[PDB]
Amino acid sequence: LYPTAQSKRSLWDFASPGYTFHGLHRAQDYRRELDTLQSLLTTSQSSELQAAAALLKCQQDDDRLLQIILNLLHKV
Amino acid sequence: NITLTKRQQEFLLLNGWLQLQCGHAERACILLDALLTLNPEHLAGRRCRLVALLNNNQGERAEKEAQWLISHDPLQAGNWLCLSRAQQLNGDLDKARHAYQHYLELKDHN
16 A cells, blocks of 8 residues: 555666666766757647647756856856 | 657657656646657657646546556556555545555565
8 A cells, every 4th residue: 555665666676767878978968868859849739748848948948047047056 | 640759759758757847737638748749659658748737637547558558568566556545536436445455565675
């Protein structure tokens, strides 16, 4: 019935993809795939794809906002 | 007509997995549904989405996904834990006890 620390560890390990995104420069490669993928999925007519495209646009703009915050914490 | 590169499949997978770690199961499900709409055979994605559905309380979908994985990914204990949780979400408590007992037996693969 209820969960068990063993139950949730088996859940995590089950859901966890492990090492993924196989590349040499995680930061540039991430922003590049995010932008490419977000502009790619809007062109879908599928409701399921359209929702993903919207969420990606979101993190794309939350990253623009955090970039603004990060600049503010550089100067003192 | 849309096709995902390997890196792009990995990207969505990793975004779905990261949102699921944040406790954001709907966001996880949306990302993983898009992946599994275009690459239905992405097993890591099937698993991650299966657990995300179990946390966003989509028991009937979670069920169909768990039996799907059991029929396609075999001897895997986690499939049975997912079936148990999905079955308990659907109110079939006994179906969940049979599924949980199968889970215990293969966790016993040690």
